Design a binder for this molecule. Structure first.
Ligand SMILES: Cc1cc2nc3c(=O)[nH]c(=O)nc-3n(C[C@H](O)[C@H](O)[C@H](O)COP(=O)(O)O)c2cc1C
Length: 362
């Protein structure tokens, strides 16, 4: 029954330990990347989660890499998100917004002026992103060759994250999750494989972690450390982007830096679901010694794996992804040991209510 006990996460208190991982569903209105009342119903159905982490959300127009993914930089996006957050809070839910810059995982057709996406270095992501075809449905297309960010542009990236954090507060979100994982811009700077810069944002691990820590510091000054969460995937390979040959020592450095700032939480995307060997207990203990706030584990999790790790004090909560897609009352189903609805993966991305808001409760 430890999974169902409250947990203080920053400035709020989650009602339980069963969190909803960020889940890109690509159902926003285009043009504008505007959240919809359908998305509002989708998140309202899952308000029983201790903490809802929204789908990844653009901090700016340049940050767009997925067609149909929402933003939170324009006034109409802010107004739409405010309706979504108010609905979750009315059902005693709590919600954070995941802010991302896709970086090199993007397509030129989605960028301002149709130009090349930006990245720490001009290196192809070697993977695909999702566009929308003539019918409006999601299609996979290889990512465009990115442009190396000039040193002069980096303060603009930090200001885009800061403004999005201020926008998140105006839209009524409880917390912010910086998306520093899964091969996107913040992770691209962290990884030695994707960061070949020779200025103070490349090379050493403190240089590779400089940008993300400047964003954390800007978020602390903008709103407060108890409002800033961060998601990392520092061990393994995600979307053809590995963490370099010194991944364990580089992960512990970044985590220690985040731990000193006393941020809201650390959300770790583990290599299990991505096809990799899981964390050892020795590594989790090294993480716990360097990060004191709540730790959220995600990726190929089960209730038994969550209860064991929480019992050992290695993590404080678990974030489920696909199980929340198909089960709007996942907390009640897990508590009552009930079976879960089958997942309809063909309707994960794009489309409308089908495979989105039409999953039944118990
Ligand atoms: C449809 C789908 C969309 C996802 N979108 C995001 C996202 O926007 N941001 C992110 O950090 N992870 C994203 N992920 C990864 C999940 O958040 C999480 O790492 C993973 O799904 C958890 O493993 P689980 O599904 O077995 O519980 C997504 C996963 C799926 C299946």
């Amino acid at each position: 029954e430890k999974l169902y006990s409250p947990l203080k996460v920053g400035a709020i208190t989650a009602a339980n330990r069963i969190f909803m991982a960020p889940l890109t569903r690509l159902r926003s209105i285009e043009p504008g990347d505007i959240p919809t009342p359908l998305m509002a119903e989708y998140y309202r159905q899952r308000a029983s989660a201790g903490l809802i982490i929204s789908e990844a959300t653009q901090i700016s127009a340049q940050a767009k890499g997925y067609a149909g993914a929402p933003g939170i930089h324009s006034p109409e996006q802010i107004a739409a998100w405010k309706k979504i957050t108010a609905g979750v809070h009315a059902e005693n839910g709590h919600m954070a917004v995941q802010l991302w810059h896709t970086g090199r995982i993007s397509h030129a057709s989605l960028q301002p002026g149709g130009q090349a996406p930006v990245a720490p270095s001009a290196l192809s992501a070697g993977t695909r992103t999702s566009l929308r075809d003539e019918n409006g449905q999601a299609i996979r297309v290889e990512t465009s060759m990115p442009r190396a960010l000039e040193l002069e542009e980096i303060p603009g990236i930090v200001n885009d994250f800061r403004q999005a954090i201020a926008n998140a507060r105006e839209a009524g979100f409880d917390l912010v999750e910086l998306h520093s994982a899964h091969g996107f811009l913040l992770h691209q700077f962290l990884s030695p494989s994707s960061n070949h810069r020779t200025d103070q944002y490349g090379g050493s691990v403190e240089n590779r972690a400089r940008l993300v820590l400047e964003v954390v510091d800007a978020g602390i000054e903008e709103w407060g450390a108890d409002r800033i969460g961060i998601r990392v995937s520092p061990i393994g390979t995600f979307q053809n982007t590995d963490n370099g040959p010194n991944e364990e020592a580089d992960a512990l450095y970044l985590i220690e830096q985040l731990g000193k700032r006393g941020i809201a939480y650390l959300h770790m995307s583990e290599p299990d679901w991505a096809g990799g060997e899981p964390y050892t207990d020795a590594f989790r203990e090294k993480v716990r010694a360097r990060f004191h706030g709540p730790i959220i584990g995600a990726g190929a999790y089960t209730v038994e794996k969550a209860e064991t790790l929480i019992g050992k004090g290695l993590i404080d909560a678990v974030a489920f992804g696909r199980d929340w897609i198909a089960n709007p009352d996942l907390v009640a189903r897990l508590q009552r040991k009930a079976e879960l609805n089958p997942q309809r993966a063909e309707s994960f991305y794009g489309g409308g209510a089908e495979g989105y808001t039409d999953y039944p409760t118990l």
